Subunit: 367 residues, 2 copies
């Protein structure tokens, strides 16, 4: 049979200077385990790659450096905009293969997020802790780890799609005929989950014909919410700035308010504090402030470095990703989102949100 939850356990970074505590597997423990048990390969994919920025990040880099010297095939995918450190990285690990990726050479907007590890088609991490010293040590993150080969193998398929967009000669990023020849495969989706777990994907032009668009799955779960919606993202503003122009995209923003007003859903938003100079953030905040008075919407803000992207619906479905709920991300950026309906794993994430909601780093919205 298949184990419930697909051997998934929560993984988070809780910096020393922050009051967050838990018994979960730490990001440092997780990355150290993946390298220690590796026998074949270690595939890593995140936007930026800068392990040497903190103490624990540099230790992870040494263990990874030692693995590549022992004969482990190690590939690190980073977006071509996180290319500044590439010289520093290769000089430290000449045996690790670093690959810069541009998933959107047509419009130069789509960024590689992914944010996952996978090794030997057995172990994997999915979350919002990039392969940077900050995400490993000093920045609050949240992710999932599983030693279930059927699940990790499905995540490795996401790595095959991103690696195809290398900035090297006639590949899937430079030739459209080679991008159409990509078997963009998945084994589990919302229609066929594994132990109550499945991955959703983005953007739509890399989705293929079998994968689930994360945009569709998230909005569906928001609109299907019957009781509660808990979200811990960076921002829920319906307007973001791509290039140098503002981009309006209220798709996620609407489905949340639709739940609060039309369906009476209790909603708690734990977002980052906004710029007093950004009129789009000020206006969105004053709109949310008025909805708290009339409906059951609650908003708290944080100012710490926090990459947590968490969504919980009805204490029945959990969504952990590396992208933020806005138009820039869900229309262009390439990432993998963790989805689970296992009540037990969902209960552990609900405990995480409850802790963060009452943390000292979470103050109630005031305008």
């Amino acid at each position: 049979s298949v184990p419930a939850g697909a051997k998934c356990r929560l993984v988070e970074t809780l910096p020393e200077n922050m009051d967050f505590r838990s018994d979960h597997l730490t990001t440092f423990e997780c990355f150290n385990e993946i390298i220690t048990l590796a026998k074949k390969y270690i595939y890593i994919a995140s936007f930026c790659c800068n392990p040497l920025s903190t103490t624990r990040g540099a230790l992870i880099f040494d263990k990874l450096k030692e693995a590549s010297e022992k004969g482990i095939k190690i590939i690190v995918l980073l977006d071509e905009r996180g290319k500044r450190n590439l010289g520093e990285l290769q000089s430290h690990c000449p045996d690790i293969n670093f690959i810069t990726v541009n998933i959107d050479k047509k419009n130069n907007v789509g960024l590689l997020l992914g944010c996952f590890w996978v090794s030997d088609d057995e172990r994997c991490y999915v979350g919002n802790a990039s392969f940077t010293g900050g995400s490993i040590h000093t920045i609050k993150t949240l992710g999932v780890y599983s030693d279930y080969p059927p699940l990790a193998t499905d995540l490795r398929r996401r790595f095959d799609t991103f690696k195809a967009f290398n900035s090297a000669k006639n590949s899937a990023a430079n030739l459209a005929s080679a991008a159409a020849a990509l078997p963009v495969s998945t084994a589990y989706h919302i229609k066929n989950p594994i132990g109550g777990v499945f991955f959703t994907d983005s953007p739509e032009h890399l989705l293929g014909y079998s994968r689930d668009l994360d945009t569709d799955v998230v909005i569906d779960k928001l609109k299907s919410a019957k009781t509660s919606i808990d979200i811990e993202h960076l921002a829920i503003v319906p307007t973001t700035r791509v290039d140098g122009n503002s981009y309006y995209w209220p798709d996620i923003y609407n489905s949340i308010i639709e739940a609060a007003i039309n369906r009476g859903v209790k909603i708690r938003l734990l977002v980052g504090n906004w710029d007093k100079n950004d009129v789009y953030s000020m206006a969105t905040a004053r709109s949310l402030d008025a909805l708290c008075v009339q409906n059951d919407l609650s908003v708290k803000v944080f100012t710490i470095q926090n990459n947590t992207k968490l969504l919980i619906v009805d204490d029945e479905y959990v969504h952990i990703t590396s992208a933020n709920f806005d138009g820039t991300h869900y229309q262009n950026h390439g990432f993998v989102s963790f989805n689970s309906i296992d009540k037990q794993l969902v209960s552990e994430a609900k405990k995480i949100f409850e802790r963060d909601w009452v943390s000292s780093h979470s103050k109630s919205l005031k305008i």
Copy 2:
């Protein structure tokens, strides 16, 4: 051949105590002409019916009373919620047939708006001037009049659909099998306009298979706007109160902001002033106020009694209706909207908006 504009001319009510002036046909002149030229029937449909509230309204009622005594079939459709005056009306005109309509006996939300006259399948008025003394004399209204039989006959078909929902025995309002036996017919729509003119309809459950849903046509024109969007409605708030519960519906509200931000459309909103106690109106205003600073959105408010429901896009398409751009209306209420792409008639409406925009009764939004 067919005349351009379909013999359509603008009709508006400009009360004495207001600075609005024009050379157009007045609502009082228009209703007086329809009655004077009538030889067969005069069909009237509006929410409320109260002609005796003003001097000019009572004169219209006398001319209509005289027509019914001369052998003209006169039917007045009013919603069952405007039934208070029914005793006063029938005692004054025993020969006029008054019919109370309930288009939504399932949920008791949908109201009859329509707001049009039609006579002899030759003449007709469409607009926002109800058959009340206020709309004829003391309230600013805007409408269209045409003596083109092919257009007026298509409007009479809208009257056949509403009359079927009388509150009398087994009819289309009380039997679902008789409501399905309704030939909900139209001759002209956006795909087949007459002289650049066509009617759109609402709600969707009375639309039939051939008519255009006003919701779809309006949003399409908003999203297709390339340069300008001028709107003079009562409110553009994405939240309205049906029954005793708030209803969130940002479909129209979004497509406007989408034009201003994503497409740089110059937009001017002339809406009514809001309640300082309504948090949904206060929040929507403060959101619009921030969009005026960053984009080309402009908002002015009025406090006079004004039923004007006007939309102009790119100086190329005009939309005049009796419903307000909100969820309560475009999801439940039954009305007829005037649509014209005749550049000449559109230019006359653009002159109307320009006058209203700089009127003394239009002050710039301040919060």
